[PDB]
Structure formats: C-alpha cells, structure tokens
Amino acid sequence: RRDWENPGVTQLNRLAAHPPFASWRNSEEARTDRPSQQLRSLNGEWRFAWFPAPEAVPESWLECDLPEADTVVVPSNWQMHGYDAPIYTNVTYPITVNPPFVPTENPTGCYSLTFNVDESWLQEGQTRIIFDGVNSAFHLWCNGRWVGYGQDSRLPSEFDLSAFLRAGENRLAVMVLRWSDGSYLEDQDMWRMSGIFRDVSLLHKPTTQISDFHVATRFNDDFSRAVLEAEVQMCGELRDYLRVTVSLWQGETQVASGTAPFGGEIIDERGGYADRVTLRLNVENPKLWSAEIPNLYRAVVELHTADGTLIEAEACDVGFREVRIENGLLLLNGKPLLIRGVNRHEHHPLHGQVMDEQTMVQDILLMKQNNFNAVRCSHYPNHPLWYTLCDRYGLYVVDEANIETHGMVPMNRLTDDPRWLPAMSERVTRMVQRDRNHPSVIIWSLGNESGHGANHDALYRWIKSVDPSRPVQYEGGGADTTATDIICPMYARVDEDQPFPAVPKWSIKKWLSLPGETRPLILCEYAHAMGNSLGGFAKYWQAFRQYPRLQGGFVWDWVDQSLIKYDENGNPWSAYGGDFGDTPNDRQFCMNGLVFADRTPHPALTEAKHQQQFFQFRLSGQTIEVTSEYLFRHSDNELLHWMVALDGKPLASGEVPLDVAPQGKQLIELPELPQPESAGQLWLTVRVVQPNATAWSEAGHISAWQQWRLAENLSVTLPAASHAIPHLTTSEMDFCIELGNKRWQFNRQSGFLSQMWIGDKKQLLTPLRDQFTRAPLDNDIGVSEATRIDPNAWVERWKAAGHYQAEAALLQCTADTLADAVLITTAHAWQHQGKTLFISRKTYRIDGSGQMAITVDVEVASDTPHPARIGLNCQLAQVAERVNWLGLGPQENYPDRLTAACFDRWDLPLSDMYTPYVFPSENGLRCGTRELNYGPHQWRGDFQFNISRYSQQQLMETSHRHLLHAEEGTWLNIDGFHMGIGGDDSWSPSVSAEFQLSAGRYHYQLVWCQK
Amino acid sequence: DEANIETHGMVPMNRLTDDPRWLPAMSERVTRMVQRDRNHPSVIIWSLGNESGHGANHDALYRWIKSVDPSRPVQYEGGGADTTATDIICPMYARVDEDQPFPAVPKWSIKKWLSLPGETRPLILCEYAHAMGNSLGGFAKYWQAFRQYPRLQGGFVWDWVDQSLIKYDENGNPWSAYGGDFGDTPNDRQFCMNGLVFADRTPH
Amino acid sequence: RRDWENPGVTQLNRLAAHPPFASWRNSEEARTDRPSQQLRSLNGEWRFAWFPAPEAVPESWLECDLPEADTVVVPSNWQMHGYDAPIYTNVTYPITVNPPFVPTENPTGCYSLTFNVDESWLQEGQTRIIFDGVNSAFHLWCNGRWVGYGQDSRLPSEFDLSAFLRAGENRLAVMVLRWSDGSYLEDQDMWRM
Ligand SMILES: *[C@@H]1C[C@@H](O)[C@@H](O)[C@@H](CO)O1
Ligand SMILES: *[C@@H]1C[C@@H](O)[C@@H](O)[C@@H](CO)O1
Ligand SMILES: [Mg+2]
Ligand SMILES: [Mg+2]
Ligand SMILES: [Mg+2]
Ligand SMILES: [Mg+2]
Ligand code: NA
Ligand code: NA
Ligand code: NA
Ligand code: NA
C-alpha cells in the first residue's frame, strides 16, 4: 500500500478529533482539573530501533522485541539520540520535489512498548491510545495486529484499541516514517526531525460518552450580560433517561447550571440531531478574559442518568471574551487591540522539538516580563499544554494549521490543486476541532508560506462557517487575499515600499489606504531578530500607535533554533545548519530569536520590552503626563519612580503611585529642582515598578521607563595652569613626546601613534589606527555566500569596494611646539585599486596636563558605499576587570537600536561588554558615551565604543562563537560614527537612510588621558 | 450542472454534509465535475448537489468554485433554499401566493420570498409544478408571476420523463412498471413517475 | 482493505480529471471534431458474471475468463439484464444507514474483456483507460495485475495502463460493487441500479 506516498490517504482507522478529554467519573475532579485515573501517560522508557527504510523492518518486530533495539525515552526526536542527523533547510525541501513521492531510503523509527492494561478498562467501555505528536507518519500495531495509520505530525492521532488489548501485559508496535506525502505540507523553516515527540497516552471512555462539546459566549452591548452556550454530542445508545448537565463555576461559586435530555432543535426537513443538546446559561456581569486580566470560569459537562447517576464528566476553562473585526479594527471585548506579539517555535537546544511545561512556563514568563501579550504558533498547532498556559497566564494566540509548502514552485502549486484539498483540509479542520474552546486562541491561521490557492479560499470559508467567533487570517499570496480577514504581511516596512511583482510588500502605512482596502493590518512577522538585529524597531512602534488600523505584529522570532553539540573534551557548543553533516543546509538562518536557545536574552529583547511598554509619557515643565495603554485594567500595581542626576550623579528622586484608568492619563508634578552646582547635563529618568508579585512577575518588576534631558549647564570654566610643559623629541623616524613619566611615540613613516608608556610600561599592542569597517553582521551579509555572492548585500558592497582591503597611505606627519603643548598633525589616504576611498586628517594636542586631545576629520568619497563606521581602533596591552562609562547602557546598543538604553553611569565586568552571538560579528557597541574608563585609561568626547578580547578580524573570520580565543590585551574600537544595524529583514539591505554614513565629511574629537 | 451528492435519507439531512470527515469525498464530486465541464458554454450555473441539508462542507465547496470559476453562478437549495451557499434563491415547490411556513426551512410564497428583509438575490425554482400523473394544475399561475416580477426568473419543472421501466407479461407483452414491481421493498411505488412525457417519450 | 467502506478512500491510482480529450494527431480533424484514431471505444460485448458479495468472487477470475460467465453488452446496468432487481426508493436509503458501512451481501458484477493493443500504442506514449460511468465503485485489474480503484458513479474514472498492457491480446477485469460508502452520497429519488 505505501500509504505514505498518497495524499488521498492521510490516515486509516483514526477516530474523530475533539477537545481535550480526561473522562473523569467524579465531577469535582473534573471541576478542579485534577489528574484523571481514566487518562494514563505511556511516556517513559520505550524500545527503539532505527532502520534505513520501511522495507528493512523485520516481520518479527511485530510480535517481539528486537534484541538489538535500545531503550530510550519517549517522547523524543530520534535525531536528538544520534540515530540520524537532524537537517536544517529553510525553503528547499529536504527531499526531491516529486510529489507525492518520497525517497526510497526513508529513515524508519521502530518504537515498541510492553505495558499493562487493567481488566477493568476492558471489561467495559472503550480504551483508546492517543499519539499527540508523531513526525511524520506512522503505522500502529497492537499485539502483532494492525490497528491504523496517521499523518500530520502536529495534531493528535487517536485509535480504538479496545478489541486489541488483553488484561495484563500488552505490546505496542509503532513504525514511524521520516518522510511521507505529509512532508510536502511540512516545509517550515526549522530543523527537520522525526519520531514520537509529543505525549503518548491511554484514555478510557464509557461506551455511552461525551464525544464532543463546543462552548460559546455571546454578549450584550456593553458586556454586562452574557449567554454561555454549550453544544454537547454523545456517542453510544440513546435512551430517554440520559441527561446532560452543564454547570458554570467561578472558583468555588457555582455560577449557573442547566440540565437537559438529548434531542436538539429541528435542523432541516429530516429533523434535528437526536444525539446532541445545547445548554444555555445566563451570566450577569461576567468577569471578562483578556491578556491583561485573564479571568476564567470552569465549565463542567456531566453525562448522567435521570436518577442522578454520573456516567462521565468532561470540562474546560472558559474565558468570557468576544473577538470581532469592526469598521476595519480588531476588537477584543469591544476595544481595539495592540498586538505586542512574537512568533514562537517549539524548540529546545537539547531535546529538539519535544516541549516540557517548564520551558513553556519559562517562555511565557519571559514574554510577559518583556511586554509581549500575544503569540503566533509558527507554524502548526502546538502541544496541548501550551493553550492551557496561554489561557491561564493571558496571551492572545494565533492558532495555525500545520500547512507550509514554501518549497513548491510556484508556492501555491499544491494549494491551488483540488487533489491536495483533502489533506490540507484535515490540517485545518482537526486543529479547530481540538482548540475551539480555548479563550486564548483569538485568531485562526490557514498555515504559512503556501502561496495562495483555491483550497485556501475553501478552507477559509469552512472556518468562518463553523466558528464565526474568531477571525481567519493567512499571509500567502500577497498578505491581503480573499483568504484573510487581516492584512498580515511578513517584513513589510514602515515607510518603504518593496513593490515585488505579484506579491509586493507595501509600506504598511500605505497599504492600509490602498483603494478599496479596509481591513486591519497586523504583521504576521516583522523585525527579523537574527544576530545583532532589531535595528529600526521603534519605527514600527511609532507607526502602530499613530495609525488606528496598524494593530501591531509578531516579531520573528522568540528563540534561536540552535542545537547543542559536544566537543572532543565533552564541552557543549551551539550548532546550526550544516553542523550535523546535513546538506544542503541554510547555516545560521535557524537563529533568528530575541533570546538564545537557552533562554538568555539577546540585547534586542530589551529594545522590544521598552517599545512595547503599556505606559506612555510626556514631559512638560515639572509635569509628567503618564498615559496608560491598557484597555481593561487600572494601573493597580504600579508605582512611578523618578530620579534626576547630573552626569550620572544623583541629585534627587522620589516616588508616586500610579492610578491611571485604562486609556486614561495622570499628571505628576515634580517638586522644584534645586539648582545645581557645576557644569554637566541634568537627566530625568522615570521607571514604572510593580510593587507586588504576580503570576508572571516578581515584586519590584520594572515594566517601563523613559528619560529626558533637563537643563544643561555648559562648562566655561577656564582650565588651569599646567604645572609642566611636554617635550618633543624629533628623530628621523619618530616624533616622541615626554611628560612626567609618560611617553608617546608617533612613527614618522606610518603616521600613527604606535606606543604609549606609563613609566616604562608599554600601553599598546597595536598602533592607534582609523577603522572604517566592521565584522559583518548577519544583516550585512544577507544571503551572500562565497559559493554565491549577493552583490547587493552590504558586506559585498564593502568588499568589492576594497573597504576591507584598503591601506593607509601617509600624506602628512608634522610636529609643532606651542606654548604649553606639542601638536602632531597627520593626514592619511585609504585607497584601493587607485581610488581614494577615505581621507583622515588629525591633530594630537598633548598638553601640560598630560591629556591627549585628538581631533579627527574624515572625507568619504561620495561614490563609495557608505562605510560601517568611522573610528579609531587599537589593541591595548593591558587587560582590566571592569568597564566604566558615562553614556547609554547598560546593554549593547546601536544607532537604530538604542531607545531602551539609558544615559547614566554604568560599570560592568569586561565580559558583559561582549555579546556572544552564535555567529560572531561586530557586537557590544554602546553609543552616546561621553566618558569611558578602562584600567588607568580614560577617553572623553561623544562617541560610540566596544571593548573586548576579540579583534574585528577574528570575529569576522570566525563562524561559531565557541571557536573564538581571547587575544592578548584588549581590543578597543572607538567610533565617532557607526552605521545602524538594520533588521527589517535579514536578506536584503535593511538599514534606513537616516542610519547610513553618507554625509561625506565627518568630524569627531576625543581626549585620551590617564586616571 | 450539478454535483452527484444527495444524502436525503440522513437524519437530519445534513448529517454528513456538516461532517468534515465527509468533506473530501464531497469535494471530489464537486471539483471533478468542474474540471471536466468548465469549457461548455451551455453550462451557465453550477449546482452543489441536491437534498443534503446545508452543511459547512457546502459553504467550503461553494467558495472553491467561486474561486476557481468566477464565470458562473453557484446555486444549491439545501437547508432553506437561501443559505450562504447559493447565489440564487432556488426553492423546490414553493407556491405562488401561498406560504408554507415549515420550521427551520419554510417555503415562502415566491413573490413574498424575494422581498424578505434584506433579501436581494434572484429566485429561480430548482423544482416546481410536480408533473406526476394528471397534474400541472395551477401552471399558468407561476408564468404569470415570473412575467410580472423581474426577480422571479423562472424555474425547472419536476420533471421531464417518467421513470417507468418495461416488463413483460406471461404472454410476453410489454408493460410500464414502477416501484415494488421488481420485488423491491421497501419502495415508493409510483413516485418515480412524475414526467411531462411518458418513458417512451410520448407526451402527457 | 474494504476500500468501499471508507469515505477516506475514493479512488486509487486514478488520473486527474480534465476536459474531454481525443489526442488528435491531425489538426484539421480536431477543428471539425472528427473521430480520432487515438481515442478508441471499448464498448460492445463483454463477459460478465454476477456474485452476491465480493467475497464470493473467485481468484481464478483475475487471470482467466469464468466459463460460467455470460457475454453481455457494455455499457449497461445489470438489473436491466435480469441479474438482480433494480430498486425504486425515494428518500429511505436502500441500505441500512450505518455509515460508512454497507451490507455484507453486496451484489458484485464481474466484468472482463479480452482486447487487442497495437504495438504502436506501446512503443511510445501513454495509454489510459477511461470508464465514464461505473456504479457505484470498482476495482480494476489488467492482465491479472491490480491497477486501481474508483468511486462517484457519475464522473469519468481514468487509469494509466501504460505499464500493464502488451502488444496483442490483453485482458481487463473489473469488479463492480453495487453498494459503497459512495452510496451515502447517492440517495437520489430514482431507481437504484
Ligand atoms: C517568516 C517565516 C518563518 O518560517 C521564517 O522563515 C522567517 C525568516 O527567518 O520568515
Ligand atoms: C425534488 C428532488 C427530486 O429528485 C425528486 O425527489 C422530486 C420529487 O419527485 O423533488
Ligand atoms: Mg498519505
Ligand atoms: Mg518558509
Ligand atoms: Mg471508499
Ligand atoms: Mg431526494
Ligand atoms: Na494602531
Ligand atoms: Na529562519
Ligand atoms: Na498603582
Ligand atoms: Na563571523
């Protein structure tokens, strides 16, 4: 049969999909959501053997364990146990595109289990097995007898074992195929693995049972009244004595309850459903569910007899909320949302695609703590627990069918084909059938990157028809097709259009008002966070707040998909595409998250948190106007804290509880600001602090901040009389300046400061030289490959221009003595292939005080590509424990990604000044710095810097962080100007014009002195 | 041109058509027809089938066609004759002046049906003037209404030819037989004979 | 497999649907809609045998004519040849309502045909068989080897026989089921044949 190469056969003997069941036989346990004796986990130790193809599997295996098999933990992805290599390919299918066929060599996972079954489960009722996740297709045998077949690696497949089991010891046999016709619809950009990777369980239901139930909540005009409607279906023999009671609870209080026999209303000429019944419960003043306040009730549905004998009970958490699109806006409980979303894959650096509650909770808490309120299940239905958690913790969820055919050419080749309709359909219908009762799901998604085909329009309608309660969305085919209620592009820019033919990405602002367009636009993906990215994030936040119909988006994405590998010494390191011998592969493209695989945040996360703050501020005079962006709750767990500091030195501060209604404003007058004695700039910082712990945060949690410069007092204070005069020593080859026990040497042929001594201690390992390039970022690189250059990428433009190859030719090097100083003057050209790319002119004024004042003026040929930076660099001989500075921090920050950073006095261990991106590149910059301290040195001015043990050269020659080695001394990069990092997407130039170094002529000044 | 989908015998009528598990089988009966017949100019309208209630599978299917072949309207009478799965109000047996307010699926007078609040589609009966036996009494009343009302655009009489079959007597002479004449049970006797013409084409 | 009791399986190995074709190798003929030598009719006399259930069908049939068979015209409805009764039921299903199951006594019509294929058809190209109407489901074999399966008694079911015929005499065997899960979608007010 090769059922695995036939999309017309997606399963055999599989039971209907339904909401989460547990078959409680006690109503209070169902009420309390306690573990059910009728629902058992078979997770644990199973038997496993790997085969190269289904054909190589021995018949024997069906009746008995293969000696050669191993004992392994289930759930798991067999690649994570080393049986075979996980593959990381983005768009290109990991198998030849020749649908519906798959390779003859098809890795086969044979799992088996010997377990007990109680007679009580067999003497009556129905016993079924549930495979929550099997990637990608499988055959099931029970006690050597064939049961059935299942496809769709992202939804549970259930089978009735009733007739196959026997009291006592039983044997399950599971043959899992790595590739199947289903893989054609599973082309998501992530690691390609296989196995039984989600839960395995046994569920017992009575023969007369609840076979399905739908819970709906509808409201009056101002949501002060609701009707809970519960449609219940049964299976088994109908009898007049059967009844269904549905009861609604608010904690221990029973809110409402309705009982009725089966027999629904007339549907058509043939009657109604004798096997269903709809209970209707009235609820006054329901407590509404929202990401802000996730209030839930509990619905308990009891199947029982007229005398009161309980047969069984099913149950769910219910959130009272209404989702609707009205007048072009997506409303929740009647208010327009502002989605602070993120896409999130099910990924664990050690367990691969196996999800545990701990990691789930970890993610949800970080998310909330970081001001996210929404999540998109990229790109398949999630492990069941995910929904319980979102319901309870409060996240708006986009549930998405497991459908992605990116690999086809054109992309809708399979989706526009009626022969793939059925397969696609089940991916949609079974998702709905499973998740329809979770309040956290507020939107349905047709899947991802499958172009736009007719099957999509058909599927869009089915849903709208069966569940009018949630909008349907879908990005394929241009993001605004007839298959979507929401304009939901991926990587559309704020202001700049990308008019691709057939599927342009318009500026979002512009897309809204295209002729005839009226829908809401919420990006399904934006601000691609690969490496040192998120450049321009604020720009999205500013347009979302200004335009009502711009309702947010989903950042791409939450966590890097890196895998843990171990070196010969047994140490672990983070691996990406190709690191397993997988080819072809897409290397680092699997690492696009705000947090590392291990949950440690990337610097970008803080930028996200600050822009997604729910409190907005304005300052006027001594007045601070705080506006709440909450739609439902009052600022009941917030205090505003403020502080005024002169150049990092605290002058005053204070606190005020916030008491602002959702969308309201609150004015706070600051007390008169005592004048200040001394030059410097006053800065006002405010912080929103939650005094009390919550289900998602700890007491003290800071939820928002903002700063403003206040008055500045310029220094006009004339220095002071130098106790000494520096001496100049002129030689053939060098200009030397000596002052006290300090010495500086400027080489005459190079034109650079090559050595500086403190006493007899040399301070430099490499001379102080201009620097115009940076170890390319992921964004600079784009998709360019040595194997296939992308001439338009930033890195390729710089290469080709000779930026990395350009060498300093000296034009001038003079020394002059002034009244109290020695002045060195130098001029250097950087050329390549006869073209002058940059010209740097400087002065070094060393004075009586030992301060070295450096002035830098640079010219950039207009026709050369704009450089990554314009700074100086050097390798210091010393290494120091801390880095102290006066400027923006404390975390890494770049021009287009510095909003979250605060101007203040920061002090960190040197290592915190390096950002360990898996794929190394320029990193650790801090901008707007007025003073930098390292060891005995201090640099003063208005610059950008990074300090670390790694040169830019090493960084750029190194592809994996674990392979970096600290060099001798400390590498210091001090930039007058640095280019923005971009990130609108990571495969095409994305740095906004305003962040390019295009002025042509640049000036900066610096003071290097000892402390 | 109508898909080969009729599940009249289910209780309620849309038991299968509202069942996703049945969406695939159904889809192929709809998509295969279109793929085959979409180039015939004579086909001016697509039909989703007959007497299978109104199910979500119908809405889905309706949309598919709308998408793939916008050159022709889609009609379907199940579940009320005016659901979201039909471009045309296409009841069977609705009367001219007389309403038949059955629950869930009333059969309004045709004239009245067109102006129900919010209604704007054209109305063309998928079935009317049941010609069984000595029938067609009140035929002119439909024509009078179709001519006077722009949106009453006609209908399809039920039906063309008696489904009677030939049998031989002991003498070998032929005779017209209907339901039950073959030992078939249960059967619906003469209900299979409702044509304007006899099984050999002679006119009634 | 009991393919006829599973709405999840409506065909096996069937070719995509498409508008009428004739593969003319002459453009003037195509213009005038003249008969095409590439489109051959198999209509006429076939061998048919009737059974009460698919289980009653003997294996022998697959490779060899049943001496017990009759010669009958095709196309036809077997009720009209007297092998069984046609049923006139309006609304009530002629079979017990228990989707997607059907009765175990299920009239089975075993059609076969021996016919010739010229080498020319086999040296190059593709040879398909087209069944325009088969009520209500069937399995097809060619030269004793299984080819495919199909349902929907009112659309053409097509299969590639390219890899199964040989120059000269060939044998088709078609097992036709009266009732199938497709019968659930075929409850029209008319004779059940
Ligand atoms: C959006 C779709 C997602 O699966 C990723 O491919 C992302 C790019 O890294 O784009
Ligand atoms: C409309 C449907 C058709 O097939 C017949 O049942 C007719 C009455 O004879 O009504
Ligand atoms: Mg398959
Ligand atoms: Mg993709
Ligand atoms: Mg079937
Ligand atoms: Mg009927
Ligand atoms: Na907005
Ligand atoms: Na990616
Ligand atoms: Na407060
Ligand atoms: Na690198």
Ligand code: NA
């Ligand atoms: Na008219």
Ligand code: NA
């Ligand atoms: Na009739």
